[PDB]
Structures are given as C-alpha cells and as structure tokens.
C-alpha cells in the first residue's frame, strides 16, 4: 500500500479502499478496484490539456475537439482518435457486429424498488439529501442502461449505487445506511467495521517512521470498512500491531516474507524474515537449463529457456521431441512422457499415459484419452466427451484453479492445463494431443516421446524396434488383434485418386488458402499421414476431417494468416446452440468469472466456433448472460445443480439462485447402496444384482431358486413396481406371446417412456416411433451383433436375442420392494410364489390368471391341448439320444465353452431335453437352446469355441460378411458414437463385414454410409427426421452431412406418431373459429359470431371421469384490425392456471411474463412459429394454434369423442346436436361465459 | 378484523386504497384523481426486486359504466400465485373458471364471503383483503407491515404523497397502469 520515490515527492500512499497518488504539483490520480476511476487537477495547466475529458478551459462545448485542433460531429470517431500508440489486434471502438440493445419491455423491472430504486429522485429514498448536492438524472439513466444490458445480478447494482453513493459523499454531505434495505452488504475481514463515515488514510505501519502528511490525507470522510481496531491496518490487510511492517531498507516496504529477488539479477534470493530483520540470501540460482526474467506478475524469477513440443498425430503417427517421425498401430493403452526417475532437485512427475481405440476399419488406431498426474493430482481428458473435464473419477466444470498451478480452461475447441512448471497439455480430442515439455529438465526422459537428448536415432532405441514395449494396464485381449492375425494393412503404394486436391490435396501445396504455412513449417510430413486416412476409409469426411484440422491447428500455433480452409461440402463443421463458427477468434473465452485466464492470452486467434450474446458456461451450453452458477471450496457447480461437496454423501447442496450454497442434511442412504464414485459422481449406488432368466419360450426361472414351468399362451406381467417408492424407476416388463408360445413383443416402460424392444427380427426397436436403429436417452439400445441389449440410467439391462429368449439383469435397490413373476428379492422360492392376496394356487397355470397384461384380443387360452403336453415325457424315456445330444455339447470334454464349469449347465440341459419331443433332434430347438445358453454366458466374457460347427446348424449374412464366434460389433462399425458396455464385456456370434465395410442396422456398406450421425441416432443417407415439438428437418444428405435446418408445421396439422415414423399429419379434432367471421364445429357445421366479445369454445364438461385434464379455452372475438374480428388473445384456463397468449405482444402465465420457447404450468408446451403464430399444446390434451393474422384453430386428438362439450360441440359425428345443443337458435350467445363478459348492464339507463 | 389491544374485533388499519368514490382514487397515501375512462386497470402488486415472503399478489378492477353509466367497480380480478379468482357482487365467485360457493375458502389461505347487506369480502392470510361494495365500491387493506414494498396505481406505502401521486410519472398514472392482458386491443378498429 505505501510506497515514496521521493522523486519530485511522489508519493502512492492510499486508504482502506483507495489507491491514491500524490506529487508536488497536486495531482489527485483515485482508483477503485474496481473500475471507478479519480484524475483531479489544481488548474494545472488552465489554458489547455490533451485528454479524453476536457481541455480545462471552463467551456463544456469546445471540449468535443480531435487532437488536431478541429472539432467532431461524431463521439465513437472523436473518442477512438485519442487512443495510445500501439499495436491493436482486436480493438474495435464500438460494437461492429449485431450489438445486443435491451428489450424496453423489463425497463419496468429493474427501474421500480428493489432495483436502481433509490437512485431515483425520490424524497423518501436513502440519500435523499444528495440530490441537491449532485444532479442524478446521469446517475439514473446508467444505472438502469447497465441493468438492462446485464443479466440483471445485483454485483452490477449495489456497485452503481455504492459509487454514485462515494461521488455524492465526496461533497462533504452526511449519508445515512443503505446497504441492509438494498440487500447488498459487504463482508469484510477481520474486524470489518462497516462506517458510513470512516477517517481516510487508516493508521498503518511506517518502515521508517519519517514521512510527511499528504494533502488527501486531510479531508471530508468516507463510507466503507475499518478493521483497524484492535489489529492495525497495515500490509494492504489488517494486521496485529507486531507484525512483519515491512523490510524497511531504503523505506521500501516488504511486508513479512516474499523470498523477494533483491537485485533484478535474481542471483540473490534475500528472503527478509521479520524475526530478526535480516536478509536470507543466497548467492545461487535455480541452473538447470532455466534463468530469471522479469515476471508478468511482475515478480522477477526463475524460468525455462526453451520449450519443446511432442505431438501425437491422428490416423499413429508420432514424433519424437528431438524429431524423429515414426508410425504403428495398437489398441493397448501405452506411457508418454515419462521421468525415468524423481528429479532430485526440486521438479516433480509428469507423466502421461494415452490409450487407443479401433474406429471404422482396422489397422486403424486413434487417441482414446490422456491421463495427467502431476503433484499428486490425476486428471483426464477423453474425446468421448468432449468439453468436459474429468479429475481424480469425477467431472468438474472447466473454469477449475488451483494454488498457482493446475489452471486448466478452455480455449477454442482445445482444452488446455498448465501448472507452475514449462509442462502444458492440449487436447482436442479427434485424436490429437501437443505436449509442451520445457528444456529445464533432464536429457534423460522414459517416454514414449522419446529421450530430448537431441539425437533422433536413439530415440525408441531401449524400446527396441517395437514401439510397443512401453506398455501398461490394458485390456485382457488387446494384444491378439483379430482371429485372423492383425488383419488389412493398408497399401504402402497407396494407390489412391485422393492425392488430388479434392480430397486431401489442400493441406500440401494447393495454393489457395493454406500456402502461406509452407515457408513456416514443412507440410510434406503431414501430408503423407492423409493419404494413408483416405486409404483405411474411402472419402469418408469423418476420417478426413482429424488430418487437416490437425494440419489447420498446428499451423495457426505460428502466428500466420490462414484462409478459409473448410466449407459446407469439404469437412463441414458442427457445434452445439448458441454458437457460431469462427476461423480464428478469441484464445480465452471468458468463464464465469468475466475475464480471460491470467496465463497470456489473445496470443494466438485460434481456430473453432463461440458464443454469441452469452457466456461459456462450466465449459459448454452457453449459457445466456448474467447466470452464473456457485463457486464452493475452489469448484464451479452450475446453477440448480444438487452435489454433495464432502465424501459418504454426507450434504445435498444446490446452487441457489444469486450464488447461494443452500445446504441440508444428508441421511447416508438405506444400506443397501454405497457412496461409491462411479460414471464421475459420488452418490450411493447399489451394490447387488439378480437374474431373472426367461429361458426358451414358455419355461421361466424365479428370481431365487425353483423353476415354474408355466405353459400359457398370453401377455403376463413378469416384473413390476408392486410397492411404490419416493425416489426410483419404474419399470414393466411384460411377454406378449403373439399366438401360442409366438416370439414375444417385449415392451418396457421405463421412466414413463415406453421402449419397444419388441421387433426380435433382425434389429428393430420401435419405442414410439419404430425407426430406432441406434438411440440413446433415458433408455440405451445396443444391437449386441444378432442380441440386442437395453440398458437404463441406473444400471438396469436386459438382453433379447430377438428369438423369444429374455435375460433379466437387475442390479437396482428394489430389495423386497418388487414383486412379480421373477419374484420378491429375499431367500426362498416360496417367498417367490406369494400371492398378492395371499392365496396360494397349486396351479401354476392359475398363477399368472391375475399378473396378466391388458392387450390380450378376444381373452386368451391358458393351457395345451392336454395340459402339460405330455407327449414328450413319454419320448424321452426312450429317446436317450436326445439327452445325448446337448449333454456331450455341454459335458466337461464338450469344449462348447468355459462358462458352463462357472455356471452351472444343468438349467440349460434341462431345458434343452425338455423342448417338445416331437420337436426335438438337430431342429431349430436345439440350435436355439445353444444359441440361448451361449448368449446368455455373455453376461461374464468368457472363452466360447462356437456353439455352431460347419453345417450343423444353419446361419447367414447379407453380404461381404464372415462369422466369427468373438467379434465386437458395437464398435468398429457404422456409427461414430457408442452405446456400448464393451459391447457388455463381451466378444459374441454375429456376422463381421470385411475389406471395407459398415454395419448399418444389419446390412452392409462398403464404406460410403454413416456420414449422418447426430445425437439421438444414425440418420441412413438420403434420409431424414423430423425431431419433437415439430422440428422440421435435420435432413441428411450425400454431399454435405447435417445439415439440420428446422422449421414448424403449417396450418391444420398436429405432430403425433403415425404409421411408425413422427411427422405432423392431419388429425379429425378441428375447430377453427372465424375464417371470414364462420364457425366449423367438431362435426360439419356453420355460424356467424356476429357480435364482438369473448365465447367459451372448448371443455371437458364434467359427468364423464376420464384423466383429460379440465381445459376452457376462450376467445376474445374482437374488432382488432379493421373491425374483422379477427381472434385477438387466447385465453386459456388449465387446471392449475391461466395461459394467456397474444399473437403480438408475448405470453402470460398467471399474470407474470415468460418467454416464448418454454414449458409452463403441467406439461403445457408454448412456442412462437416463425412466421409470426403462436401454438401451445396440451400433453394428450388440447392444441391450440393462433395465427399470426388472427385465425385460431382447435386441434383434439380422436380419442376425445363426445366427451368435450362446447361451442363447438360434441366429438359424436352427429350434425344435428354439434351445431345445436338441445337449444333453438343462437348457441354463441348461449355460450358466452359471464366471467369475463364485462356487466354493461344498463349502461344507458 | 385484527387482533387489537390483546382482544380481537375489527378496527380501522393503515392500508385504505379506495377505488371510485364520486370516480375518485385514493391513493395509500393522500392523493386525487379521476380514472376519466372505461377499462380495467392494476391496482396494486407486490413487484419484484423485494424478496418478501408476501405472497405475488395483482388486484384489477373493471371500472365498467355497469350502473347508470358510473363507473363503479363490476367485477374484481385477482391474480393469486395460484390461480385467478373472479368475484361479482350480482352473481357468484368464481376459481379458475369454475363457480364456487360464497361461504368457502378456496386456492391458498384465501377466505371468501358475502356480506349479509350484500357486499363480498376477500381476504388473505398476511396479505390483501379486498371489500367489494354491494353498490360498487371498492376498498384494498394492506397490514402496516408492507411500507414500501407494493408499487402500483395505488402507489408506495412509503408515507411520501409526491411519490405516491406520481411514480416519476408526469401525468394521468391511470392510463400508465392499464394492464394490456386483459384490456382489448382496440387498435385500429376504426381503420
Ligand atoms: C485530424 O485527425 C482526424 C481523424 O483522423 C481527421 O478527421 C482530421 O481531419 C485531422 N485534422 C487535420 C487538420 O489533419
Ligand atoms: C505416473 O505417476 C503416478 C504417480 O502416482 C504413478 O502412479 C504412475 O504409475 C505413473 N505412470 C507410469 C506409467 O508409471
Ligand atoms: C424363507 O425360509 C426361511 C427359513 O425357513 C423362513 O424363515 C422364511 O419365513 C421364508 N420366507 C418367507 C417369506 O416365508
Ligand atoms: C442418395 O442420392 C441419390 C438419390 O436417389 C442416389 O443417386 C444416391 O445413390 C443415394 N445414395 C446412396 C448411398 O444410395
Ligand atoms: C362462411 O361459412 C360458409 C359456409 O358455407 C363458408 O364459406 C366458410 O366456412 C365461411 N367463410 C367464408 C369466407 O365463406
Ligand atoms: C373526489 O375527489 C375529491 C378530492 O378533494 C373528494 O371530494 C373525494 O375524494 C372524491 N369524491 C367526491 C364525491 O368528491
Ligand atoms: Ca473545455
Ligand atoms: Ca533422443
Ligand atoms: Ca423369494
Ligand atoms: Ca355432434
Ligand atoms: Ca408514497
């Protein structure tokens, strides 16, 4: 805080909030921290001064001049003309770009009480005296114009009120509290004595104790905080009275011990220790290759010389830090960069490990993830999510600093960590990562970039020639590449059409855009790893794309101009909402807290797409402006996000609203769960698992135990909820036998989204809508090769084979609670066989007569022609070859598989000679029962030599595929992202296309497919898909990939599911109210209104008792434009409110405000078409869509049928009573509800 | 009625916003002036930027001819965080859009009767109570507690007229406070 050069006696000795400056001349130079500005002049200089305000001449006028002596009709030329001297990259003196004004309409909001309140001109208002004292009509428009631009946080408005409050205060005029009224306090340290009147210039502590009194010093009083009794003020902070008062040589003020550099030199350590008031100095140096220099901080000291950077390409290609360029390919997750040993001398581990996957073809590798551990901390960045970071098995928000070190961001597309040391790490996923390894350490590094001892050839040399020694961890199987050993190398001649400039021809020597890199660094070697891309996988952009946006990135690293290199046809580029494409833009976009990281930045405009009229939020979403989430012991939670801060699940806390840490107690969860970290959050998980085996077609297993052979022949309810609970999933699972024992169309309702499942043939989940190859959401489907598997949030799954054969996993805390056909969770079988009503029937056909599924047609029969069927018991006794058959499969010398020695083939053999006699032999029931049983040992990998030989049993592709009984088709196929468990831990029978090859919902494309991938599922090309709430198009195309421009659905139309495939078709609800002033009823009907007002149309007029939620809608009919009356709101009254929506203006919600594209109320979807109308829908409820001109039409799904009755009748079909309700003429009058209806009971009288 | 002097009958309360007397407002503190047009206009709310457990609370009031060309109050809108409560000294009360008795209590804490003279009395618990004239006056009650939190036509309960009168308005505040949800449009009718 003080500081004296004694140099013309400047003096820089400031307050408790201030920085005050002081020379002989009475320069007054102020300086809030946060930006509140004081530059005062004792008629310095009265006849003229160059500056932004003012020439001092006592003329406001002649104050509007350019530094040239003229004066300027415009403030952003005349204000831009007196800018310092200098380089300016990216200064632009007012807003260029689409500048975000204010809406008008919130002006109301922040100008009344509670917001820019007081600082109206009002009597009763805190203050009130200053407004005599200072004019603060300025003072008042700046406030509510910040606000307003704002996103409206208070920060903004007590630090307007707090200064216009010091200006005011500055004339000597007493103010009395406003901060407890206004909300906004300040929590100071220490003793933190909030004084609205505090003595400026605080004691403090003087190294010497000689100086003289400054002029400020000596003057009016100022608001703020003194904590200087007791502990004095001293050290920028409040100090005891025998604390460090600076070093004192030369009346500098040290204050404690900094371990400061004495000479600029830095040879010197000099830490001044307060105990004895002496130097600790050294005489030494960090060495090491690193020297001092001045510090940004401005804190001189040590620093590395030179930096070296080792990248690691994508296809793979690595180089080597003293440069040497090699390439292989593996699977098994490998070292990088690591310190053969501890480095002695004060320098910690940095090593890195990295892991590859298989995408697309083979021979194939890309960077999977990075893991970092360096002081003790390991953290990791996968391309699977992307911008998102991930520390120690738990996801952060991105913004996350540590002490001085570990200050990971985001910039760009990269995202990037650097400590206190040279090492820094970029990763952008799409498989590139750039390490940046300072000099300062050893020559002598194990890493698998290479020892930096300057000599390429030794680099790999302890290794051997495999790059593949430095291995670590891995998976049980990464080593044995394919059955077929480490299968299609590409052609070293690569004899490609692709070295033209179409494809893979712009990174090296095009001209064009990307020539001016040559000079700076050489493209060949770049060059060279595309052509090998486009050979593994042919044209596709998705391959394409990593090669020359790496080229693109480790270019425009050297400060260079680079053109526009990608475009809408040639690797076109996708980002999520609120974000645009940029070329090359800002480095450091801001965080939550507004302001770019400390390390240097803007340095380099980086190539990816930003924001726009919004803020990087924790890494993604951008958020819009001004809601931020919390900060909590050094971590950033988004707004409305519940976390436990503490291990053991000790404290739910949520992010309240302004920043709040609202936080309650915690009760540790039933013990039947673990506050576990797992799927990078910490929350009790369960801990068990139970099977629930649906083996063969009609046999079943128990949860626990006995088997129930049950032989009916309908829809059954297997497992279900019984006993509801406050927090967990539902799930029903029921078995639609189709006809006698017909392959079951499953259905599961988990969540309450319903998930088809149900379409075994081939791969064909239908959910709602049936064309479901690949999907994701609440429910996961994977097409596990011929299985298929389906999976929950929560860890549930089943596996269906598509042949009538169903294998249970539930893992959830449902113990006791779920009951069912599988049975309770406990002990015995018999707790199983309890009945909901406690009567137990000894007939197991009877059991399931009350656990049936609705759905059936016409009822169903429960039993065989004799029951039990006993024809194959007789069989059997004398069909020994039979048994014969499957046992020798499955008998311990039988190496059908391994699993069978861990579980128990009995079951399954069982089964196996009790499939139907008549039936049985080498038939399709006993492939089926092998094909059953080795899918199901699934569920733990185990080795399996096929369930099938030769001809034995029959098995097919489409094409271009051979079977293998170990492949993993969840990956290495045609979609680029994965639902998979490992494809569950396992390597199953299926069909494995060759040479070049997708795997699109069974079939096969040579390599020309699958460029359409978006977030909910594969789009097949020329294709497309019209998304919920009615979102037009995300079409797909052959040319170019995505392109998902959306729109809404025209007039009389609804979005609704039909013939398997969501579009918007017609529907038979329509009312449509007043084209030129006629009323269409329900059924064929018409009417004149004929007089202005507002008429009930529509409602659910009680007596019938049906879940249709009690809906009135009404129209005020009105002049409006040119007396057409035209529909001008609509109000509607749901259960739980009123909706009122104006095709102009926006829309209410109990009389409060919202915007346009929003839910509100209970299910009630609002949303503005582009055009101009506005449409609100009902979830199996009314639709309402309002022109934009004033036409309303009333949309009603047929299931309503005579159940509303209204203006527009009942849903009969009859003519006759829709146009009149049992009533003689006139039904508008009839129907004008009186609620709104003003009285204008005689008015003229 | 409001427990007084530790016993409990009804008494004269600082919050008296009284609508159309001879067509005149009465602001909370003392003011003046004439309504001069036919509409609906916002009394009275508990506008943001507060944090007050006060419940959001939005009276109306259809200044309407209705009798003898008057301008009495006809109806009385409240805008209750839950709902809408409609409430017309000939007919009855309506919640939601559904008729209700007149002896009930209805939507959170809010109590509804009839006067036997024939006026109709709203009240909520620690908020507004409103008492509709049989003949078509209208007077709003606010406890003392709330100074200077509600902003509306009625104005602050600050205790200032100036700012009461006039919200940093220059004239006719009436026309300011007219709510565009309920009121018609009327834009170009005779266009
Ligand atoms: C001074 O500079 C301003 C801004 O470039 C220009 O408009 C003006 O004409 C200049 N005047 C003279 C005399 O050069
Ligand atoms: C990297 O350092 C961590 C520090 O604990 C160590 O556990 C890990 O094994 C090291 N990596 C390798 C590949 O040795
Ligand atoms: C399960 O068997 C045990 C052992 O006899 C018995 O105590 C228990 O009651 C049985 N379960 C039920 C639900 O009856
Ligand atoms: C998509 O575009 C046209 C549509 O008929 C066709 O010529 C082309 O072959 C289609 N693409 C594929 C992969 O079939
Ligand atoms: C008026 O009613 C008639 C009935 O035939 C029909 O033309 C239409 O539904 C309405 N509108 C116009 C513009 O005629
Ligand atoms: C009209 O306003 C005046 C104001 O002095 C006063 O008489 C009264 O409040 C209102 N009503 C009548 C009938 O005058
Ligand atoms: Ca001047
Ligand atoms: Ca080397
Ligand atoms: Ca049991
Ligand atoms: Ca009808
Ligand atoms: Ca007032």
Redesign the pocket.
Known sequence: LPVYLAGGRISVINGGSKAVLETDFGLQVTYDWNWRVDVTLPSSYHGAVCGLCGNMDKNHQNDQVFPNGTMAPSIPTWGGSWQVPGWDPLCWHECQGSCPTCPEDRVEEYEGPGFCGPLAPGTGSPFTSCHAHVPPESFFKGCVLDVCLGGGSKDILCQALAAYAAACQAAGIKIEDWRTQAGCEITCPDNSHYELCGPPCPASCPPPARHTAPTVCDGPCVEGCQCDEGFVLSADQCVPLDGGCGCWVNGTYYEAGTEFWADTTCSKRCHCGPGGDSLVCKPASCGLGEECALLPSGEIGCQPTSITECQAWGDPHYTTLDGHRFDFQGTCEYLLSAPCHEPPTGTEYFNVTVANEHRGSQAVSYTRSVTLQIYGLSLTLSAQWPRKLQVNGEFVALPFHLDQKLSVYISGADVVVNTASGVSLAFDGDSFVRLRVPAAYAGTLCGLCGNYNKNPNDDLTAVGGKPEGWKVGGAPGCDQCEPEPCPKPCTPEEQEPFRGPDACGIITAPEGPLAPCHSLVPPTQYFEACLLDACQVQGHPGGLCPAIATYVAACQAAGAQLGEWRKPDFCPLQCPAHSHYQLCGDSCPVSCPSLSAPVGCETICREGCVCDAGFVLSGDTCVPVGQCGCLYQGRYYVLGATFYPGPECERLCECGPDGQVTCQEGADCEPYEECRIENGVQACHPTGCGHCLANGGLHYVTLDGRVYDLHGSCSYVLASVCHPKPGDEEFSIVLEKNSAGDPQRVVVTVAGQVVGLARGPQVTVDGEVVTLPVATGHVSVTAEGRNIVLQTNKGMKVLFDGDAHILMSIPSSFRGRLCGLCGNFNGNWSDDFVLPSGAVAPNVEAFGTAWRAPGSSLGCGEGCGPQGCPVCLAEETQAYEKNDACGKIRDPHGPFAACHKVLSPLEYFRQCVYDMCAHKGDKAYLCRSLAAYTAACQAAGAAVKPWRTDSVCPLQCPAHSHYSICTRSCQGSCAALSGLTGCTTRCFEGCECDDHFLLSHGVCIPA??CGCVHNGQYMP??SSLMSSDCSERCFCS?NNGLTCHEAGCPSGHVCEIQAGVRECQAARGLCSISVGANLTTFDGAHNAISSPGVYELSSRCPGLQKNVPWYRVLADVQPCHNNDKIVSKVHIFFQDGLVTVIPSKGAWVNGLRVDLPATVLTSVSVRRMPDGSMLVHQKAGVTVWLGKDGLLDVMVGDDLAAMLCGACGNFDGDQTNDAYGSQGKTPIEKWRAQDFSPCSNTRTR
Do not use: I, S
């Open positions: 020309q497919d090309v020329n052959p």
